[PDB]
Design a protein around this ligand. Sequence first.
Ligand SMILES: [Zn+2]
Length: 154
Amino acid sequence: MVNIIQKFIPVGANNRPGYAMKPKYITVHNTANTAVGADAAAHARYLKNPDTTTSWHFTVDDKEIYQHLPLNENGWHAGDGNGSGNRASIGIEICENADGDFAKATANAQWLIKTLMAEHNISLANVVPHKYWSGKECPRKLLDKWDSFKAGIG
Ligand SMILES: [Zn+2]
């Protein structure tokens, strides 16, 4: 059990569409941000920035987890417009801050996905990477061994 801090993007913000959502998929991402301090809390603040344009539900680092959006709304992260990526899936971001431990962040993320699958009846097969929707190289550090990553969710 990892601690999940809720810090919802305010209603009204540009990056919070508010469109109703019934998640059927779960999209895994990698911030691709190696800067020091670029953790979960950092992304929560970043997302509440009035000029931010993207948005997702969870951000994971080696220490804890932040929720930016309710699970009944969508976010912009799968880069596939109104496709199921953005409109029917829970977006999760795994931090890569050089001052943290990616392996530990991944273990925390695997726990979150497992719990998320049980609460919204989402099969392991519907746990896909960002690359599944837009074809972009994301999660970069996870793609190479993607099958092994899912095998560890349990
Ligand atoms: Zn991504």
